[PDB]
Enzyme design. Structure first.
Site, PDB file in Angstrom:
ATOM      1  N   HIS A   1     -12.375   5.901  -8.199  1.00 17.37           N
ATOM      2  CA  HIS A   1     -13.417   5.308  -7.540  1.00 17.37           C
ATOM      3  C   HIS A   1     -13.660   4.235  -8.468  1.00 17.37           C
ATOM      4  O   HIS A   1     -14.432   3.840  -8.252  1.00 17.37           O
ATOM      5  CB  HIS A   1     -14.962   6.401  -8.512  1.00 17.37           C
ATOM      6  CG  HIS A   1     -14.644   8.286  -7.480  1.00 17.37           C
ATOM      7  ND1 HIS A   1     -14.915   8.940  -7.963  1.00 17.37           N
ATOM      8  CD2 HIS A   1     -14.562   8.710  -5.820  1.00 17.37           C
ATOM      9  CE1 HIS A   1     -15.064  10.082  -7.094  1.00 17.37           C
ATOM     10  NE2 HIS A   1     -15.073   9.423  -6.092  1.00 17.37           N
TER      11      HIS A   1
ATOM     12  N   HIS B   1     -16.615   0.214 -17.142  1.00 14.27           N
ATOM     13  CA  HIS B   1     -15.233   0.430 -16.498  1.00 14.27           C
ATOM     14  C   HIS B   1     -15.856  -0.120 -15.211  1.00 14.27           C
ATOM     15  O   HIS B   1     -17.440  -0.931 -15.416  1.00 14.27           O
ATOM     16  CB  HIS B   1     -16.052   2.060 -15.267  1.00 14.27           C
ATOM     17  CG  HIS B   1     -17.370   2.676 -14.654  1.00 14.27           C
ATOM     18  ND1 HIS B   1     -18.602   2.626 -15.743  1.00 14.27           N
ATOM     19  CD2 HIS B   1     -18.379   1.926 -13.706  1.00 14.27           C
ATOM     20  CE1 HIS B   1     -19.603   2.730 -14.864  1.00 14.27           C
ATOM     21  NE2 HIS B   1     -19.130   2.472 -13.686  1.00 14.27           N
TER      22      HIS B   1
ATOM     23  N   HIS C   1     -16.998  -2.556 -10.092  1.00 13.30           N
ATOM     24  CA  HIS C   1     -17.503  -2.184  -9.737  1.00 13.30           C
ATOM     25  C   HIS C   1     -16.698  -3.359  -8.246  1.00 13.30           C
ATOM     26  O   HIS C   1     -16.882  -4.447  -9.750  1.00 13.30           O
ATOM     27  CB  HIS C   1     -18.558  -1.596  -9.181  1.00 13.30           C
ATOM     28  CG  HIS C   1     -19.482  -0.163  -9.772  1.00 13.30           C
ATOM     29  ND1 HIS C   1     -19.248   0.849  -9.585  1.00 13.30           N
ATOM     30  CD2 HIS C   1     -20.044  -0.656 -10.897  1.00 13.30           C
ATOM     31  CE1 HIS C   1     -19.155   1.955 -10.033  1.00 13.30           C
ATOM     32  NE2 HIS C   1     -20.026   0.962 -11.551  1.00 13.30           N
TER      33      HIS C   1
ATOM     34  N   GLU D   1     -23.420  -4.154  -8.132  1.00 13.29           N
ATOM     35  CA  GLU D   1     -24.073  -3.338  -7.619  1.00 13.29           C
ATOM     36  C   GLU D   1     -25.365  -3.647  -7.730  1.00 13.29           C
ATOM     37  O   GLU D   1     -25.909  -3.870  -6.554  1.00 13.29           O
ATOM     38  CB  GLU D   1     -23.723  -2.196  -8.447  1.00 13.29           C
ATOM     39  CG  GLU D   1     -22.317  -1.373  -8.612  1.00 13.29           C
ATOM     40  CD  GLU D   1     -22.460   0.375  -8.682  1.00 13.29           C
ATOM     41  OE1 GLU D   1     -23.286   0.620  -9.755  1.00 13.29           O
ATOM     42  OE2 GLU D   1     -22.609   0.350  -7.795  1.00 13.29           O
TER      43      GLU D   1
ATOM     44  N   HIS E   1     -20.144  -2.293 -16.126  1.00 10.87           N
ATOM     45  CA  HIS E   1     -20.844  -1.117 -16.415  1.00 10.87           C
ATOM     46  C   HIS E   1     -20.804  -0.617 -18.000  1.00 10.87           C
ATOM     47  O   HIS E   1     -19.362  -0.152 -17.764  1.00 10.87           O
ATOM     48  CB  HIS E   1     -21.180  -0.380 -15.940  1.00 10.87           C
ATOM     49  CG  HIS E   1     -22.742  -0.371 -14.469  1.00 10.87           C
ATOM     50  ND1 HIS E   1     -22.426   0.236 -13.265  1.00 10.87           N
ATOM     51  CD2 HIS E   1     -22.509  -1.761 -14.321  1.00 10.87           C
ATOM     52  CE1 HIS E   1     -22.599  -0.272 -12.459  1.00 10.87           C
ATOM     53  NE2 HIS E   1     -23.293  -1.843 -12.579  1.00 10.87           N
TER      54      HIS E   1
ATOM     55  N   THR F   1     -25.630   5.564 -10.936  1.00  9.95           N
ATOM     56  CA  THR F   1     -24.807   4.873  -9.754  1.00  9.95           C
ATOM     57  C   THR F   1     -23.657   5.796  -8.355  1.00  9.95           C
ATOM     58  O   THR F   1     -23.232   4.940  -7.734  1.00  9.95           O
ATOM     59  CB  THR F   1     -24.407   3.876  -9.346  1.00  9.95           C
ATOM     60  OG1 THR F   1     -23.216   3.020  -9.839  1.00  9.95           O
ATOM     61  CG2 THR F   1     -25.710   2.477  -9.685  1.00  9.95           C
TER      62      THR F   1
END
Ligand SMILES: *[C@@H]1O[C@H](CO)[C@@H](O[C@@H]2O[C@H](CO)[C@@H](O[C@@H]3O[C@H](CO[C@H]4O[C@H](CO)[C@@H](O)[C@H](O)[C@@H]4O)[C@@H](O)[C@H](O[C@H]4O[C@H](CO)[C@@H](O)[C@H](O)[C@@H]4O)[C@@H]3O)[C@H](O)[C@H]2NC(C)=O)[C@H](O)[C@H]1NC(C)=O
Ligand code: AZM
Ligand code: ZN
Length: 266
Positions: A64, A89, A91, A102, A115, A197
């Site tokens: 992910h 990590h 996104h 996000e 994040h 999230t």
């Protein structure tokens, strides 16, 4: 089990994880003409960021995102409780498409978002335990845009993506100055109550989203967008668009740690 797209995609998360359908979710669009200035919001004070331990840090592709484990010796000093670092990590979106962050500020997304996850160790003994409790976590959100030059700090992470292309692979990253992953003007940030999230979407996060963005090169972005796979083996599928859609503010207040001339709030 869960994914961003498809039968088990984000539009269906609530069918498996009730809280994802609750009303104090993350991410959100932060509209500056609606935030409230809070003169009492303290300077964040990241401690130990310049030297995250002396041992190699684990970097994991969990299907992910790509996640970097962090030592609990790092922590934030300007919050209601002592929040210790656990991991960071990313996104992102995908090559040829807009967005990837996000959160949004004034309805504009950027290409990616970092994040850095912390948990209240004054109250809990582990990240997982704290992740299900009210304000159990404090996450720092850094929106990432593209600049003219290579960002060395992010390169410390990006240079290892080729070692963890397949889901569940891991590699090591030498300690580096994490402060350099943060944008300029740490004193300008937004603060609100929100959630994880990703499933189970627990409403456990005291969010901090910086006002200024960090910048990585066009080449670093393409690398972030197309190296990792969401798969463990062939056929391979690139891990892309791993950001959740915006969630309704639902009357929560977003606070700003700063104010300036022309601010859309007073
Ligand atoms: C995220 O969500 C949490 C949970 O809802 C919010 O936490 C609440 O924050 C409010 C602050 O506005 C707290 O309420 C205020 O408490 C003050 C006393 O604070 C001390 O005591 C409380 C209770 O024991 C502790 O929680 C706190 O840590 C302190 O030790 C009062 O002085 C306030 O009263 C004054 O203002 C009200 C206006 O609402 C007037 O009506 C009163 O007359 C008076 O002037 C007020 O009661 C509340 O206690 C917190 N709840 C919890 C469980 O912590 C976070 O603020 C929120 N964060 C963000 C960024 O949105
Ligand atoms: C254990 C833990 O931290 N889980 C998380 N799930 N989502 C997170 S995020 N994208 O909100 O930072 S953190
Ligand atoms: Zn995240």
């Amino acid at each position: 089990h869960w994914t961003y797209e498809g039968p088990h995609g984000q539009d269906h998360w609530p069918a498996s994880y009730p809280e994802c359908g609750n009303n104090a979710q993350s991410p959100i669009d932060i509209q500056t003409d609606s935030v409230t200035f809070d003169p009492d919001l303290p300077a964040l004070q990241p401690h130990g960021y310049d030297q995250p331990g002396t041992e190699p840090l684990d970097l994991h592709n969990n299907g992910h995102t790509v996640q970097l484990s962090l030592p609990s010796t790092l922590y934030l000093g300007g919050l209601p409780r002592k929040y210790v670092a656990a991991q960071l990590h990313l996104h992102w979106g995908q090559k040829g498409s807009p967005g990837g962050s996000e959160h949004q500020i004034n309805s504009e997304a950027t290409f990616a978002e970092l994040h850095i996850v912390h948990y209240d160790s004054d109250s809990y003994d582990s990240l997982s335990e704290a992740a299900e409790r009210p304000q159990g976590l404090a996450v720092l959100g850094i929106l990432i845009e593209v600049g003219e030059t290579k960002n060395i700090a992010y390169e410390h992470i990006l240079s290892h993506l080729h070692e963890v292309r397949h889901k569940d692979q891991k590699t090591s990253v030498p300690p580096f100055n994490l402060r350099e992953l943060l944008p300029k003007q740490l004193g300008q940030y937004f603060r609100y109550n929100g959630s994880l999230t990703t499933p189970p979407c627990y409403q456990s996060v005291l969010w901090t989203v910086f006002y200024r963005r960090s910048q990585i090169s066009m080449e670093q972005l393409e690398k972030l967008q197309g190296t990792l796979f969401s798969t463990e083996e062939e056929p391979s599928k690139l891990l892309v668009q791993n950001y959740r859609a915006l969630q309704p503010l639902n009357q929560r207040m977003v606070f700003a740690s700063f104010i300036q001339a022309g601010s859309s709030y007073t």
